[PDB]
């Protein structure tokens, strides 16, 4: 919510923790592990009846929109 970048975050984190005797914020790795529960591809579900020509997999995340574009130079790039 404030564009705050990772290097910054870690810096001010060490800063405030070593500043006043406490752990106010959480370090990155654990914050991000906790995050992984908010992006797409984390909850199970089902669909009745099954979708038409849609991969039954459910755990995927950030995909590439080329959709497997056969990279052969000759054709449209």
């Amino acid at each position: 919510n404030t564009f705050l970048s990772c290097s910054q975050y870690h810096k001010m984190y060490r800063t405030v923790k070593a500043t006043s005797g406490r752990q106010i914020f959480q370090p990155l790795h654990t914050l991000r592990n906790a995050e992984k529960e908010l992006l797409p591809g984390f909850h199970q579900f089902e669909w009745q009846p099954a979708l038409k020509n849609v991969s039954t997999s459910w755990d995927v995340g950030i995909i590439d929109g080329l959709s497997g574009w056969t990279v052969s130079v000759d054709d449209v790039p």
Binding site: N53, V54, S55, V60, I63, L66, S67, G68, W69, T70, S72, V73, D74, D75, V76, P77
Partner: protein, 351 residues
């Protein structure tokens, strides 16, 4: 075998990497304009002219009886010999649209009248196909033949999509090679037929083909399933031993292993060939000539017109032939700043 740089005074925002060129009754027509037709010309087909080294583009028209065609991307081309019933015609099928899907429909383009005031008039008749219909695809090959002495056509080549069973919305833009079946196609009726011979080891795409006197030779292209580009030039001999349209196939030794070629007839059965792409990244460079007869196909390495540097460096390129040795090649004019006309053009002549 000389090259000279041309430029389009205008009408530059409208040439996609694929397109086709037909010649008939004098002038030459470009087909397959990028995106759908604007208001300027609802047909999309453009009369293309070279005037004093400049490139000019005017609009084309149609009759009322004409059936209107979308701007296919990279379909197959075929010339119907001028005779009864209507000389002459060009058969087009089927390529893909400004959207990603195939036509699976045969169309026949002809010229009707002129001028009056140096205008030209055409028409496009769709021909329904019954069968035993050929599968929709693109980048395949089609050619015309006469077997004692009846006139028909042969279809072979082209990739396609996975069936709507493994049609996967994460590979939904992947292509795969259609199985290697030859197809026989008459015009009236349009009853198509599917055939296969064991020497048809595999289908491929972008393999230029040619034929003479109802015998057809497929030249070099590229296979994706094995990532290779087989030098197998393929012969087949077709005959309608009425009422059985029987074919016989065979593999020949030498076929040039380049892909996506550009061809111009300098005479009756002679073809100067620019060729587009030999290897996976190294584009084709040489300039070849093909004669052909019952003796066979004879090949020669004609003099390659000495390219410029800016063309010698770009990755890919394309073009067509205005007719009779004449030809146009086009390179992505990748530079700064973008005009936005991103395509340089070279006129190229034989002898």
């Amino acid at each position: 075998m000389s090259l000279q740089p041309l430029t389009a005074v205008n009408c530059g925002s409208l040439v996609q990497p694929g397109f086709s060129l037909l010649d008939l009754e004098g002038d030459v027509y470009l087909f397959g304009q990028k995106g759908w037709p604007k208001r300027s010309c609802p047909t999309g087909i453009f009369g293309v002219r070279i005037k004093k080294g400049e490139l000019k583009l005017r609009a084309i028209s149609f009759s009322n009886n004409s059936s209107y065609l979308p701007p296919l991307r990279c379909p197959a081309i075929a010339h119907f010999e001028a005779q009864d019933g209507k000389p002459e015609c060009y058969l087009i099928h089927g390529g893909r649209t400004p959207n990603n899907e195939l036509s699976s429909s045969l169309y026949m383009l002809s010229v009707d009248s002129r001028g009056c005031n140096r205008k030209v008039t055409l028409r496009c008749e769709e021909k329904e196909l019954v069968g035993d219909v050929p599968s929709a695809r693109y980048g395949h090959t089609l050619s015309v033949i006469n077997s004692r002495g009846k006139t028909a056509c042969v279809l072979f080549g082209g990739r396609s999509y996975m069936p709507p069973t493994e049609r996967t919305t994460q590979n939904w833009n992947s292509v795969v090679d259609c199985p290697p079946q030859v197809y026989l196609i008459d015009l009236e009726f349009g009853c198509c037929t599917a055939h296969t011979l064991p020497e048809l080891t595999d289908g491929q795409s972008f393999h230029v083909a040619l034929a003479r006197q109802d015998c057809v030779y497929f030249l070099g292209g590229h296979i994706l399933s094995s990532d290779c580009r087989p030098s197998r030039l393929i012969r087949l001999h077709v005959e309608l031993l009425l009422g059985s349209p029987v074919l016989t196939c065979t593999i020949l030794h030498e076929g040039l292993t380049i892909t996506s070629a550009i061809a111009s007839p300098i005479g009756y059965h002679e073809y100067i060939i620019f060729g587009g792409y030999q290897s996976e990244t190294q584009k084709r460079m040489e300039c070849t000539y093909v004669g052909l007869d019952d003796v066979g196909v004879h090949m020669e390495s004609r003099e390659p017109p000495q390219w410029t540097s800016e063309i010698s460096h770009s990755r890919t390129w394309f073009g067509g032939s205005l007719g009779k040795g004449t030809a146009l090649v086009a390179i992505p004019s990748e530079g700064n700043p973008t005009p936005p006309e991103a395509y340089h053009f070279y006129q190229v002549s034989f002898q």
